[PDB]
Design a protein around this ligand. Structure first.
Ligand SMILES: CCCCCCCC/C=C\CCCCCCCC(=O)OC[C@H](COP(=O)(O)OCCN)OC(=O)CCCCCCC/C=C\CCCCCCCC
Ligand code: HEM
Ligand code: HEM
Ligand SMILES: CO/N=C(/C(=O)OC)c1ccccc1COc1cc(C)c(I)cc1C
Ligand SMILES: CCCCCCCCO[C@@H]1O[C@H](CO)[C@@H](O)[C@H](O)[C@H]1O
Lengths: 48, 61, 380, 47, 101
């Protein structure tokens, strides 16, 4: 019924490893850029 | 310090950065494939044709 | 012209003024990632679909086998096939969260951006409908049968609107061929309209989780949301592929591995998960026509959401009452989905009509009401 | 010391102190149009 | 008795926009009336409302809130826009009715 069975699961593997590796990196990159807004501080200084 | 070396050498000049990514992808592939197949196969000892193959490959009829 | 060729060029100014220098709220959350996924999702279906269409044969005598051939003989055909069929799901999952988000944070107040969305949804639904008939399996055939057969319940122009769609007297080759064409077509219509959707959007700009002017703090789409969206992509893409690569048929009905046959009605004819909810409301009203209208309105109801907003605030962030009502609705939908996958027998039948009943009530009566009452509790 | 400077020298010295560095920025007034340190930071590299 | 008060104070704390330092009026959806109203606010009240919001947005982006101490308290919430807003609506209802006339 599914001759591909094997190759398809060998693929599923490579997929997770890469997927894991890549999602990690991209999370860092996303965090790294947003860091500028995340840390960011602000004050209201009317000229009272 | 590798990070600095890597920075100045590879990552600083946007042109070498891309060059690194290319050669880097090349090496990464070759190895990531080998290791994964190796993991997959090992995980399935004697179940693959690659394994049982010898029993009929030049040893019959 | 201007200094940088990004804002002056008649095209780079487009890519730029809608994906790079585009003003976006500093706080839009993860529930804002689905727009891009939906987009990405779309391009991917069209790509996988074309690749499949290049090996498909639209003819009752070869439909089922052309697909089988594609999986069994075409290089990576088996893969492409998966991705496409499963991509339909990712698509719907994505589109339902996209909608949910819109309901919860009052994005629908962006009337045109919204109504075009509704139109997008409808088109997508039709698309998956015709697409499902293509492999010509048992479910493909009977699904086509069950559904198209409802029109004959419309008055006068009924029995005709049907023998017209079928191009004959029953679902047969004539129908299959026009469905392939229709399926090949609609995705482009979708892409088209998707452009319009984003255009109306850009007029106002993105709404945001708090529902208050975000002009006080806007950020350039890039890199903030470029990166944020790409992350959202991989995060979702992971389970998609996981399900698609390890449990290929977790979702698909097996009756569709059996070539369609008009002399055998399957035991339980039911749609893919993403139609269940509507299949349930369809069967709640036992009266071929009434059930049809009830289905019709189960989706067309979205066009009314904008006019049923009574809150003084845009989002549900600060309206704990609406929230639970909202989550009640969500759950209300799971139940309806569950019912759709069940046979027409007690207890299901009653449980069925109930959820249906509540569904419309929550959206037509409760929400508007609770919202009014809520304003009074703020002393407004 | 000034006649010693040639283009080649200027490039190497500016690269040394300017290229890819994270700068300090001070904005005062109706500054809404100038934005994002990120964007400004990326202006620190590539011709 | 004080039922309405208990309720209002409850729902107020229930909604929890004070956790962001927002006043009730700071959360109003900006429809046409609200829009005119804000335009009538005195320079200061407007700037104060402005910062209050931008503050709450930066909080939402950060996924945080104000420390319990800074939360707006039900009875210290100043309804700065409502007086104006009601007028804008009065004026309009007048014009509106007068034009059918
Ligand atoms: C329609 C077809 C039905 C298909 C079946 C539906 C499947 C149901 C899956 C359950 C969904 C799981 C998601 C759980 C998320 C939990 C969560 O985080 O909720 C809290 C969180 C907090 O909100 P704030 O007040 O802004 O907080 C800000 C302060 N930091 O609320 C939200 O994220 C907002 C809700 C948006 C997502 C809704 C997704 C559910 C999808 C249903 C579709 C409904 C629409 C109607 C469709 C008609 C056709
Ligand atoms: C496949 C078609 C669709 C695609 C590709 C699409 C794409 C987008 C994109 C890219 C965005 C901006 C980012 C975001 O907020 O998600 C967006 C926003 C929006 N879409 Fe869609 N959309 C689709 C369907 C719909 C549907 C079905 C509805 C609802 C009935 C809808 C309602 C909205 C609204 C109201 C916004 C405003 C978001 C906000 O800022 O609050 N869209 N859509
Ligand atoms: C809006 C995007 C699309 C959606 C939602 C979609 C959905 C579907 C669905 C649900 C099926 C049945 C899959 C199955 O379970 O077997 C299908 C099949 C098919 N689709 Fe699409 N499709 C889309 C776009 C396309 C496009 C643009 C083409 C190519 C021009 C295409 C060509 C096909 C073909 C050849 C089949 C038959 C093969 C099969 O059954 O898998 N699709 N599509
Ligand atoms: C051709 O039948 N395709 C089906 C499917 O699930 O496609 C994805 C299918 C299979 C079995 C029974 C009913 C259907 C279609 O039913 C539909 C179709 C649409 C459009 C809607 I709104 C609502 C329902 C309930
Ligand atoms: C069909 O054979 C497949 O060929 C692939 C190489 O293209 C291998 O990686 C798979 O393991 C093998 O099953």
């Amino acid at each position: 019924a599914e001759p591909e069975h094997d190759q398809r699961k060998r693929m599923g593997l490579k997929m997770l490893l890469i997927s894991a590796l890549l999602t990690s990196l991209l999370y860092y990159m996303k965090r790294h850029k947003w860091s500028v807004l995340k840390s960011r501080k602000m004050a209201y200084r009317p000229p009272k | 310090a590798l990070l600095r070396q890597a920075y100045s050498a590879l990552f600083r000049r946007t042109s070498t950065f891309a060059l690194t990514v290319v050669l880097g992808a090349v090496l990464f592939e070759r190895a990531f494939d080998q290791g994964a197949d190796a993991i997959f196969e090992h995980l399935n000892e004697g179940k693959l044709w690659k394994h049982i193959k010898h029993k009929y490959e030049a040893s019959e009829e | 012209m201007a200094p940088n060729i990004r804002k002056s060029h008649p095209l780079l100014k487009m890519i730029n003024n809608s994906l790079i220098d585009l003003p976006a709220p500093s706080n839009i959350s993860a529930w804002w990632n689905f727009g891009s996924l939906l987009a990405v999702c779309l391009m991917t279906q069209i790509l996988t679909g074309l690749l499949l269409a290049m090996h498909y044969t639209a003819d009752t005598s070869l439909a089922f086998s052309s697909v089988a051939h594609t999986c069994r003989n075409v290089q990576y055909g088996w893969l492409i096939r998966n991705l496409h069929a499963n991509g339909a799901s990712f698509f719907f999952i994505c589109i339902f969260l996209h909608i949910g988000r819109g309901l919860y944070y009052g994005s629908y107040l962006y009337k045109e951006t919204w109504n075009t969305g509704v139109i997008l949804l409808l088109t997508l639904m039709a698309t998956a409908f015709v697409g499902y008939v293509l492999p010509w399996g048992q479910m493909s055939f009977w699904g086509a049968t069950v559904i198209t057969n409802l029109f004959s319940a419309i008055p006068y122009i009924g029995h005709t609107l049907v023998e017209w769609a079928w191009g004959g007297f029953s679902v047969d080759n004539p129908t299959l061929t026009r469905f392939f064409a229709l399926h090949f077509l609609l995705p482009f219509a979708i892409a088209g309209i998707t452009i319009i959707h984003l255009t109306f959007l850009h007029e106002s700009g993105s709404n945001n989780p708090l529902g208050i002017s975000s002009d006080s703090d806007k950020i350039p789409f890039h890199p903030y949301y470029s990166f944020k969206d790409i992350l959202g992509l991989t995060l979702m893409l992971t389970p998609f592929l996981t399900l698609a690569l390890f449990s290929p048929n977790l979702l698909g009905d097996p009756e569709n591995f059996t070539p369609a046959n008009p002399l055998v009605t399957p035991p339980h004819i039911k749609p893919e998960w993403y139609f269940l909810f509507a299949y349930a409301i369809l069967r709640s009203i036992p009266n071929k026509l009434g059930g049809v209208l009830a289905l019709a309105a189960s989706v067309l109801i979205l066009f009314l959401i904008p006019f049923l907003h009574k809150s003084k605030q845009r989002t549900m962030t600060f309206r704990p009452l609406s929230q639970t009502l909202f989550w009640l609705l969500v759950a209300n939908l799971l139940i309806l989905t569950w019912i759709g996958s069940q046979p027409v027998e007690h207890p299901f039948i009653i449980i069925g009509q109930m959820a249906s009943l509540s569904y419309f009530t929550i959206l037509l009566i409760l929400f508007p009401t609770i919202g009014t009452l809520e304003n009074k509790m703020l002393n407004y | 010391r000034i006649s010693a400077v040639d283009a080649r020298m200027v490039r190497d010295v500016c690269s040394k102190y300017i290229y890819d560095k994270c700068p300090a920025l001070a904005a005062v007034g109706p500054i809404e149009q100038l934005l994002d340190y990120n964007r400004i930071r990326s202006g620190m590299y590539w011709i | 008795g004080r039922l309405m008060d208990r309720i209002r104070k409850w729902y107020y704390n229930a909604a929890g926009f004070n956790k962001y330092g927002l006043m009730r009026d700071d959360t109003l959806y900006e429809d046409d009336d609200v829009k005119e109203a804000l335009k009538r606010l005195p320079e200061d009240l407007y700037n104060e409302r402005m910062f209050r919001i931008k503050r709450a947005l930066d909080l939402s982006l950060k996924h945080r809130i104000l420390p319990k101490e800074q939360w707006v308290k039900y009875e210290e919430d100043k309804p700065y826009l409502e007086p104006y807003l009601k007028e804008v609506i009065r004026e309009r209802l007048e014009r509106e009715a007068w034009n059918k006339k």
